[PDB]
RNA sequence: GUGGGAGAGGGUGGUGGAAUUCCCGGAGUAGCGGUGAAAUGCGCAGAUACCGGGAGGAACGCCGAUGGCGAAGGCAGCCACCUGGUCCACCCGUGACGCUGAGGCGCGAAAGCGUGGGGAGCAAACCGGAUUACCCGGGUAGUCCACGCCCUAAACGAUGCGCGCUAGGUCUCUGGGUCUCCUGGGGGCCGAAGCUAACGCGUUAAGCGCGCCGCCUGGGGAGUACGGCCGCAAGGC
RNA sequence: UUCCCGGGCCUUGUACAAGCUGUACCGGAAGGUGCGGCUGG
């Protein structure tokens, strides 16, 4: 599916709303492409900026470990 | 001796070698083995079979120190990754978690000439 | 011989060749070999040069390092009698003995060679190093290198080879070989140069070691102030900076001069200057 | 063979015993198109075996053959300008072929004067689990499993 | 002029994490590294693999794109300040105030130079190992910063700038509206008429026209010679 | 059918009576390497 579809209404510029932002990160703490998030470019740009900001604030992980083979 | 009975395993998988290091929860290594320790030299060290024997040998030693179960962490993307995981899985230790921990730069130091040309 | 080359290669089941005739005579014309002068050839190959050389040579010594090419030297040089093959590497040999032995009856020798360039320069350097009593050398040696051998003291050619040879011998470009004469086009031009030895060194023999050391030091960072070159490359020299500044004054060489723009005379003066003053 | 699968020739079953393995063995013995000589040699060896051993020669021969069947072979393979002895599993066809050829070679290498004697001795020894044939089989197997490092060249 | 919009446009400060190297502490022992296969090298003064702390330099993974911005060169972590260009809507103000431009003046990748710092990784020259180059292990300049030079290129869309006219279809970035659609500005593919020696171009023209600038006149010799200007020099015009 | 030899087909660079380039070096230059750029592969 898509991350946007698997979500209600929310703000993209909210750099503290961790519960929604975590939905846009893969198993590893990496930003998902538009292929997965299902956003327009402007939306993707704003989301990536916010993600980086939250990363700095320590709320979101820069990197992590995938628990598989 | 240590009789920790529960530790973890670090599998450094390279293109040239595979090294398995068994360790306590605290991270202090207890025993280790590689492709070279078995007796292989040169390119033979890189083979998946070498990785299998390395994993089995390290596991046997760790059992001799009285372990029962580990938590395997794999680093690198060499040719002995899956073979080492499989070997350690059925060696008798009760592996609980398999974790990928490949350390990659965030576009840091400039790589060697052979590894450059990357877009 | 272009027509005969194919025949000879095919007749044995068989690499750059001077197939053409006129110029092989011209190179020895410049080489000036007679019944009075013998020849040491190190790159005889198939013997293309050797035939026309021995047509007017006093004595012919040839060095072949590979015995795969050996079986064909005799039968291709059947009529000629002057030929004597020493299946020895010239670098690993002792040319002094061979000079004393084969050409004892003969009068003079002038080396004429045609060998791959990756082997050329070390051989010439060795033949110069050991002070052999031979008249001269004639080699075609990748023109871009020959210019560096001659190398008037500027224009991107005056390096360190230039100083060595001009300290040992005289050099001047003799002939340009037009491309494509070789059956495989070598994508590069070659030049026949001649070296003529001299009686003793060009300049002071005060310290060969220190002279060459200074030569190497001044040309490490070619694009650089000579003073910077010396303070960098010359051993320590950081704490001896003031000494260098001192010595450069009385030698009448300016600090900011880009050592690539020096003469052998100036280099000799500086070699004498720094030695016995630096330590 | 680039196109087909090269179907195996069906050998006529033996007349004395009525099995194909004996026919194959006789063929493996026969040289210069002398088949009568090979048959006589084989039957003389069978008589010797029967005379000096409790059970029928046919069982001895069959189980000796089964005893000299290798499973792992090394094949020469070119990878990166290097020659590697890759381990492979051998099909029953190749198994039987190698078994019979090795048995014959080992029999012919014995110091006994008469061909029948040599054949009988080799068959009896391979039945027991020793001799030239079994030894060569074991060496072939041990040449594999000693270079399992290259097995990933599936080949 | 008013209202709004997008952006790795530029400069100055300041901090975030990943990774490599090195130092210290712990635990543990015989290889590690590298190749097509090996060697040089490192290691019993304890190397590799592991955990914890510290030092420093350089570059910013995912998003990231056939994307965006700039006159070109070129420009990617994030925050703030200062600042340039540009698009759209309203159609409010001036009333031809315009286009181009020999000289001049400024900017100008990389590689180089001078005066001082800095130096983790990589790495010309150089030093060794295998096998002619290639490949492997080390390694100075250099790569980084400040100031001052240098002024070159496959500096390219090999296409000077401005304006007007000449079928469309499709993808995409970004504004506006009366939002199935319509109307602006960028970036790409396929194609009417037409053009071209051909390849191909084709509303982002290499079509049809007007204005201004630059440049060409057979190849080699030759971007060489001499002269002049500039540069510390290499060299540039 | 991986390799040896030969023949044919599809796609691709030179001659038929992967390179290139600015700059900087090169005492194993038939040319090589370092830092960038281009496709005229």
Q: How many structural domains can be distinguished in the coordinates of chain A?
A: 1
- Identify the CATH architecture of the largest domain in chain C: 3-Layer(aba) Sandwich
Number of helices of chain A: 3
Output the structural class of chain A: mainly alpha
Q: Which shape of chain C, going by the Cα principal axes? A: elongated
Number of helices of chain C: 12
| Count of distinct strands of chain A | 0
The biggest beta sheet of chain A reads: none
Q: Give the % helix of chain C.
A: 25-40%
Strand order of the largest sheet of chain C: 3-2-1-4-5-7-6
**Structural class based on helices, strands and sheet pairing of chain C:** alpha/beta
Fill in the CATH topology of the largest domain in chain C: Rossmann fold
Computed Rg of chain C = 22 Å
Q: How many angstroms separate the termini of chain A?
A: 24 Å
- In total, the number of domains of chain C comes to 2
Coarse morphology of chain A: globular
Question: If you had to describe this structure to a student in words, what would you say it looks like?
Answer:
Chain D: Part of the 30S ribosomal subunit. Contacts proteins S9 and S11. Binds to the C-terminus of IF3 and to the C-terminus of Era. Chain D: Belongs to the universal ribosomal protein uS7 family. Chain D: It holds the Pfam family Ribosomal_S7. Chain D: It comes from Thermus thermophilus (strain ATCC 27634 / DSM 579 / HB8). Chain D: One of its GO terms (molecular function) is rRNA binding. Chain C: S-adenosyl-L-methionine binds at residues 16, 18, 43, 64, 89, 114. This is part of a larger assembly, with chains A (69 residues), B (119 residues), C (279 residues) and D (155 residues). Chain A is mostly helical and 69 residues long. Chain A is globular, with a radius of gyration of 12 Å. Chain A has three helices and no strands. Chain A has one domain. Chain B has one domain: Ribosomal protein S11/S14 (Nucleotidyltransferase, domain 5), CATH 3.30.420.80. Chain B has helices at residues 35-38, 48-64, 81-89, and strands spanning 8-13, 18-23, 29-34, 72-75, 98-100. In chain B, a hairpin with a 5-residue loop joins β2 (18-23) and β3. Chain C has two domains: 2-197, Rossmann fold; 208-274, rRNA adenine dimethylase, C-terminal domain (Helicase, Ruva Protein, domain 3). Chain C is 39% helix and 15% strand. Chain C has twelve helices and seven strands. Chain C has a seven-stranded mixed beta sheet with strand order 3-2-1-4-5-7-6, sandwiched between helices. The termini of chain C are far apart. Chain D is mainly alpha-helical and 155 residues long. Chain D has one domain. In chain D, α2 packs across α5 (115-128). Chain D is globular. The two termini of chain D are 18 Å apart. The chains are: A mainly alpha (69), B alpha/beta (119), C alpha/beta (279), D mainly alpha (155). The A-B interface holds A 65-69 and B 82, 85, 97-101. The structure holds two RNA strands.
């Amino acid at each position: 599916a898509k991350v946007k579809a698997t979500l209600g209404e929310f703000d993209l510029r909210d750099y503290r709303n961790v519960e929604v932002l975590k939905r846009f990160l893969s198993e590893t703490g990496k930003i998902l492409p538009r292929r997965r998030t299902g956003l327009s470019a402007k939306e993707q740009r704003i989301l990536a900026k916010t993600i980086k900001r939250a990363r700095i604030l320590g709320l979101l992980p820069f990197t992590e470990k995938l628990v598989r083979k | 001796k240590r009789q920790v009975a529960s530790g973890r395993a670090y599998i450094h998988a390279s293109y040239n070698n595979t090294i398995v290091t068994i360790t306590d929860p605290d991270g202090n290594p207890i025993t280790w083995s590689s492709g070279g320790v078995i007796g292989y030299k040169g390119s033979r060290k890189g083979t998946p079979y070498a990785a299998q024997l390395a994993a089995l040998d390290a596991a046997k030693k760790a059992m001799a120190y009285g372990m029962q179960s580990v938590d395997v962490i794999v680093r690198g993307t060499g040719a002995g990754r899956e073979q080492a995981i499989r070997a350690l899985q059925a060696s008798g230790l009760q592996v609980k978690s398999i974790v990928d921990d490949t350390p990659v730069p965030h576009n840091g130091c400039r790589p060697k000439k052979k590894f450059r040309k990357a877009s | 011989t272009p027509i005969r080359t194919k025949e000879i290669l095919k007749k044995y089941g068989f690499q750059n060749f001077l197939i053409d005739t006129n110029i092989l005579n011209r190179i020895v014309d410049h080489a000036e070999v007679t019944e009075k002068t013998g020849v040491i050839e190190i790159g005889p190959g198939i013997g293309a040069l050797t035939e026309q050389l021995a047509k007017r040579a006093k004595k012919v010594v040839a060095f072949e390092i590979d015995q795969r090419l050996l079986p064909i030297l005799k039968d291709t040089l059947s009529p000629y009698e002057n030929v004597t093959v020493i299946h020895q590497d010239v670098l690993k040999a002792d040319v002094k003995s061979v000079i004393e032995e084969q050409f004892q009856d003969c009068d003079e020798i002038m080396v004429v060679a045609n060998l791959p360039y990756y082997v050329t320069t070390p051989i010439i350097m060795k033949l110069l190093e050991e002070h052999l009593p031979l008249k001269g050398i004639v080699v075609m040696l990748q023109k871009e290198v020959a210019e560096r051998m001659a190398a008037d003291p500027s224009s991107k050619e005056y390096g360190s080879l230039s100083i060595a040879v001009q300290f040992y011998t005289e050099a001047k470009t003799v002939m340009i070989v037009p491309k494509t004469v070789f059956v495989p086009q070598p994508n590069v031009d070659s030049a026949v140069i001649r070296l003529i030895l001299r009686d003793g060194p060009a300049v002071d023999v005060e310290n060969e070691s220190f002279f060459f050391q200074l030569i190497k030091a001044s040309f490490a960072q070619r694009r650089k102030t000579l003073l910077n070159n010396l303070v960098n490359n010359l051993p320590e020299g950081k704490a001896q900076k003031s000494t260098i500044e001192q010595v450069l004054e009385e030698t009448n060489i300016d600090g900011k001069r880009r050592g690539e723009s020096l003469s052998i005379e100036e280099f000799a003066a500086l070699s004498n200057g720094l030695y016995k003053a630096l330590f | 063979a680039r196109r087909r699968r090269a179907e195996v020739r069906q050998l006529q079953p033996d007349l004395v015993y009525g099995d194909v393995l004996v026919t194959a063995f006789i063929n493996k013995i026969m040289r210069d198109g002398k088949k009568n000589l090979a048959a006589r040699i084989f039957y003389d060896a069978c008589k010797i075996i029967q005379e000096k051993t409790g059970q029928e020669p046919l069982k001895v021969f069959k189980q000796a053959v089964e005893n000299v069947k290798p499973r792992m072979e090394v094949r020469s393979r070119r990878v990166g300008g290097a020659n590697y002895q890759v381990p492979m599993e051998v099909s029953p066809r190749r198994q039987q072929s190698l078994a019979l050829r090795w048995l014959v070679q080992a029999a012919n290498q014995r110091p006994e004067r008469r061909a029948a004697v040599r054949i009988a001795h080799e068959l009896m020894d391979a039945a027991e689990g020793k001799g030239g044939a079994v030894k060569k089989k074991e060496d072939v197997e041990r040449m594999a499993e000693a270079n399992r490092a290259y097995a990933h060249y599936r080949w």
